[PDB]
Amino acid sequence: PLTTEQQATAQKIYDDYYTQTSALRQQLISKRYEYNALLTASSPDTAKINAVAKEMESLGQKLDEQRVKRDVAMAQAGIP
Amino acid sequence: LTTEQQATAQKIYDDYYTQTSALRQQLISKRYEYNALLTASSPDTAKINAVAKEMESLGQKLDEQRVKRDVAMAQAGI
Amino acid sequence: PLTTEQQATAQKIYDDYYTQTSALRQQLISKRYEYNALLTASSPDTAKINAVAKEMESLGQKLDEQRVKRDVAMAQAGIPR
Amino acid sequence: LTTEQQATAQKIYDDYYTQTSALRQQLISKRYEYNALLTASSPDTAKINAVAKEMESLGQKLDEQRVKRDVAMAQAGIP
Amino acid sequence: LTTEQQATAQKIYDDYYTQTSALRQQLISKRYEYNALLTASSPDTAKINAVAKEMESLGQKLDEQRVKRDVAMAQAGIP
Amino acid sequence: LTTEQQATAQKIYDDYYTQTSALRQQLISKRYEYNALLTASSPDTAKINAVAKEMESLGQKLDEQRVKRDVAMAQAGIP
Amino acid sequence: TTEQQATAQKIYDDYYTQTSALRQQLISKRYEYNALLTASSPDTAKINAVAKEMESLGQKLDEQRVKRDVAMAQAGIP
Amino acid sequence: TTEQQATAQKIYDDYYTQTSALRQQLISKRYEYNALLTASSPDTAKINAVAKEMESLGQKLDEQRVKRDVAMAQAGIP
Amino acid sequence: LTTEQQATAQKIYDDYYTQTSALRQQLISKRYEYNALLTASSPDTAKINAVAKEMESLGQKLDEQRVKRDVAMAQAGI
Amino acid sequence: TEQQATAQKIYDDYYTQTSALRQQLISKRYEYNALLTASSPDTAKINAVAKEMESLGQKLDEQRVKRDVAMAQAGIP
């Protein structure tokens, strides 16, 4: 279980994370689609595939920084 | 449940699956684009609608084969 | 991920969609049952099965257009995935 | 569990599924027709009521066999 | 789906559950009885066939009521 | 798990199921019966209570058997 | 019915207060039974003794369960 | 893997084999523990006595689970 | 089952979690740590062992507290 | 199909050229959680581990695309 206070604090932490990361998540989701789109073309274009793969690597690293930032906040706050 | 029939079903399915693998793959590829376009930062409605019309025709061709399959079965008495 | 505001716009876009396609979805279901009836009939009738396949195809084409309007609406409101 | 019982449990069920397959197929077919009608733009109680009768009849004929198998099965001393 | 459609279906089903409490309950009793007989040490065919006929009948009464229900739903325009 | 244990376990369970098949099928026939009775329109305390006593009796004998096999399992060193 | 719901509450309510002690006691003897069956060196006299205690407890409780079941039927509830 | 899948059974078998007796007592001691909690009047001293008995058995099981986890990792298994 | 009881049990359990919170967090941390060591490229037995023990302790303290709760519950008549 | 072979060849190799990576990434992940669940987090140690996790994952995805691409050229769905 969790306290009223703990939940409150955790709710703000996650809300910020979501808000601060919205565009990023949506761009990543959009890029996997494109990735999958390309992999399933009739005649696969390896160049485009790799380019889209690298875009995903870039977005993904940014997104991990935000999560870690959020994890550390949670731990500093003393939450489970 | 019969051997005669059993061999009738798989033959229709395999003909169905073999006569449609390209379309299916193309339909899947196209849903991925559709979703990609929908999730872009500035959705391009013209592009999105064009891709939906492609899906619509691919899917029309598929359903057509699906009805053949279904009707081959009814006729096989299976 | 969705905020109070976003939950509501999405909900409204979906209700609108349900309401507008309501009779169209019912008809589509009715044809799907009829089709299955035909396929399971004691002695199968290809003409009827085919004619019913077409009615379904046309109804489904109308339904999908409505879904595209809906998905596009959603995208235009900035609502995630 | 015993041999002569398994022999009788198979012959009992196999017979039933053979004696039963046309009836189940017709009944399934009408279950669909009945639903197709109940979902028609404007409901037609006559055909709906009619189809419903076709189903009862098919079901009575189907339970009549259900009983028959259950009885054989009990006379054979099986659970 | 719609709140008013949900309210309307609820009344239709409630009316049905009330108009049939006694049949349901009776059919359930005959169901149990039927199995009590089938699992007797010495199964009594005649007695079982008679229970089947009582269930057959309760069953049709029940069905007609279902059709009323289904038609009533179709009539309210509930999916 | 072990081999000489599986044989022993399998043998004990089979005697149990054989020495109790008829008793077990009878208890089932009475649970169905009890329920049929509890579910009639006009309930009959007398028969209900009669059947309850027959189940208490069958169950006593049956539990007596289960303990007989739990001891066997335990005496053989099985989990 | 309204009346229906209430009486059952009392019926079921009477039943629970008339068996809290037995229920608990049988749960305990069943734990004890299993304890003995799983002992390093099983004592079949001890095991049988507990099986007898369970039998009594069970009988007394099944006897209440019928009283309960009879009440309900008499009060016309499923 | 395949050749390493064998190598795992071997390590688990030993673990299962060496811990049978412990595991069974732990199970029995846990049943008495519960039989005691559900006694008509819970006896604190006895309950704590059984609990300490579970500690030990527990510590002895853990102590073998660790030899196992270690045997695995050294076998270089996932 | 009773409201009054429900409240008592909820209260006994609230106490338990509140009081074992830091302890539960330390055990979770150590389990992770332990798994980290197991999956190291070249496993280190001394430190794995060292961690097994640290978990052993925390685990015993945690069990003492589970027993206290079970007894609490026991005497409260729940 | 008659191509389920190539699919395995392409996956097995993916796996073999990856085992050490996946395992080290699992270890680092465990180490990451062990640190977040400490009573008071050491944000320095946590960040260093997140970086270790970040490269491993980047190396691993690179192999995964290689693998996906292969499948695509094998004409395998």
mmCIF file of C-alpha atoms in Angstrom, chain A residues 20-55:
data_model
loop_
_atom_site.group_PDB
_atom_site.id
_atom_site.type_symbol
_atom_site.label_atom_id
_atom_site.label_comp_id
_atom_site.label_asym_id
_atom_site.label_seq_id
_atom_site.Cartn_x
_atom_site.Cartn_y
_atom_site.Cartn_z
ATOM 1 C CA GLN A 20 7.628 16.711 -20.313
ATOM 2 C CA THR A 21 7.794 13.660 -22.656
ATOM 3 C CA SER A 22 4.631 13.687 -24.700
ATOM 4 C CA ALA A 23 5.993 14.780 -28.041
ATOM 5 C CA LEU A 24 8.923 12.441 -27.644
ATOM 6 C CA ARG A 25 6.751 9.423 -27.023
ATOM 7 C CA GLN A 26 4.491 10.260 -29.880
ATOM 8 C CA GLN A 27 7.431 10.640 -32.235
ATOM 9 C CA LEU A 28 8.822 7.280 -31.236
ATOM 10 C CA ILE A 29 5.554 5.506 -31.649
ATOM 11 C CA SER A 30 5.321 7.190 -35.107
ATOM 12 C CA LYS A 31 8.825 5.991 -35.993
ATOM 13 C CA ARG A 32 8.207 2.307 -35.021
ATOM 14 C CA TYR A 33 5.260 2.357 -37.300
ATOM 15 C CA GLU A 34 7.332 3.668 -40.089
ATOM 16 C CA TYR A 35 9.948 1.037 -39.253
ATOM 17 C CA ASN A 36 7.435 -1.714 -39.455
ATOM 18 C CA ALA A 37 5.877 -0.248 -42.504
ATOM 19 C CA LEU A 38 9.257 -0.401 -44.261
ATOM 20 C CA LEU A 39 10.114 -3.915 -43.096
ATOM 21 C CA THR A 40 6.916 -5.144 -44.580
ATOM 22 C CA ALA A 41 7.218 -3.501 -47.903
ATOM 23 C CA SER A 42 7.267 -5.928 -50.815
ATOM 24 C CA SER A 43 10.875 -4.950 -51.610
ATOM 25 C CA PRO A 44 12.572 -3.785 -48.418
ATOM 26 C CA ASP A 45 14.759 -0.656 -48.578
ATOM 27 C CA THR A 46 17.671 -1.299 -46.191
ATOM 28 C CA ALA A 47 18.937 2.283 -46.337
ATOM 29 C CA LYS A 48 15.621 3.769 -45.186
ATOM 30 C CA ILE A 49 15.273 1.067 -42.592
ATOM 31 C CA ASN A 50 18.615 1.876 -40.994
ATOM 32 C CA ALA A 51 17.917 5.592 -41.132
ATOM 33 C CA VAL A 52 14.640 5.111 -39.368
ATOM 34 C CA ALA A 53 16.341 2.701 -36.948
ATOM 35 C CA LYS A 54 18.856 5.466 -36.023
ATOM 36 C CA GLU A 55 16.121 8.028 -35.505
#
